[PDB]
Homo-oligomer: A and B are copies of this chain.
């Protein structure tokens, strides 16, 4: 059968109602694949051979017991046909070291979703620099002076870190905010770290849309994430409310401009974030929102993904 491996954060701590790695494993099992579970500490390199202690996994939609390990073994990763790299951000050096280990298996012919070299090339915030015609005004800098000047030009800005996801450290500096100085000292760590500033997009009130792309093809329904109450963050992670919608026509236009690059670079499962008609980030590590969209519409995103994996393995 196909043997699929998954590197992910502890399965014992996921919420199977929302988790997309889990929805993918139910579909792989429904198709008859042998599932091999791994966490970051299980992978290693011995004389350049990527190997791992895996546990053969069995999953089921049961809220008392959703997984069971039916055996364990140490194998070379080149023994698996597909490895899904579903480790959550932050993008740190540990994450990078794991992609070199996954890359030694990929040279022995294992398919890696997503491709290790592209995970290091395409940072979720800075890859927008390759599509500046679709993004808001974006400045990446360490200097408070440049941040102050971008604020004076735009009046209302969003300042963010480059490594997190889920609304980690998002500040909005509107007109008359008394805190530009301390927010820049906090995000650049007194000018020793880069941060990103973007002009604020009022359309966030209509939702931050997560648009999913399966091997360059946009899935036709998205999830708009509406910030809630006293929150500047649309992220479900920061309490945002999700609303499944068909793609609007500027959603198709952005997703098709990016689609071919993602295919070309082996970024087989990608989550675009679109606010209004601007692209704000590209999630290539562990994008979610599969469950919410799939509940509301007749589309099997996990099926699309396994179909694309199986074509890639032919």
A residues adjacent to B (C-beta < 8 A): 40-41, 44-49, 91-94, 96-97, 100-101, 104, 117, 120-121, 123, 126, 128-132, 135, 137-143, 146, 148, 162-163, 167, 169-172, 174, 177-182, 185-186, 191-194, 230-233, 238
20 A-B pairs with CB atoms under 8 Å apart are A44-B141, A45-B140, A47-B135, A47-B137, A47-B138, A48-B130, A94-B193, A96-B120, A100-B123, A100-B126, A101-B140, A120-B121, A170-B182, A171-B182, A172-B178, A174-B178, A180-B230, A181-B231, A181-B232, A181-B238
A167 proximity list for chain B (CB < 8 A):
182
Extra 13 A-B pairs, beta carbons < 8 Å, given A172-B178, A172-B179: A44-B142, A44-B146, A46-B137, A46-B139, A47-B138, A49-B132, A92-B93, A94-B193, A96-B123, A97-B162, A167-B182, A169-B182, A182-B233
Closest to A152 in B: B230
- Bound-state CA distance A177–B104 (Å) is 33
Closest to A125 in B: B97
A104 proximity list for chain B (CB < 8 A):
129
A143 and B44 form a contact (CB under 8 A): yes
B138 and A46 form a contact (CB under 8 A): yes
A169 proximity list for chain B (CB < 8 A):
182, 185-186
Closest to A141 in B: B44
A142 proximity list for chain B (CB < 8 A):
40-41, 44
Nearest Cβ in chain B — how far from A232, in angstroms? 5
A139 proximity list for chain B (CB < 8 A):
44-46
A120 proximity list for chain B (CB < 8 A):
96, 120-121
List 5 tightest A-B contacts by C-beta distance, closest first.
Answer: A48-B132, A48-B129, A45-B140, A44-B141, A41-B142
Given A117-B121, A169-B182, A186-B186, the answer on whether A126 and B140 have CB atoms closer than 8 Å is: no
- Bound-state CA distance A139–B137 (Å) is 39
Closest to A179 in B: B171
Closest to A47 in B: B132
A138 proximity list for chain B (CB < 8 A):
45-48
A97 proximity list for chain B (CB < 8 A):
123, 126, 140, 162, 194
- Bound-state CA distance A121–B140 (Å) is 23
Closest to A128 in B: B48
A181 proximity list for chain B (CB < 8 A):
230-233, 238
Nearest Cβ in chain B — how far from A238, in angstroms? 8
B163 and A93 form a contact (CB under 8 A): yes
A121 proximity list for chain B (CB < 8 A):
117, 120
A171 proximity list for chain B (CB < 8 A):
179, 182
A191 and B45 form a contact (CB under 8 A): no
- Bound-state CA distance A148–B138 (Å) is 31
- Bound-state CA distance A191–B137 (Å) is 33
- Bound-state CA distance A46–B120 (Å) is 21
A194 proximity list for chain B (CB < 8 A):
94, 97
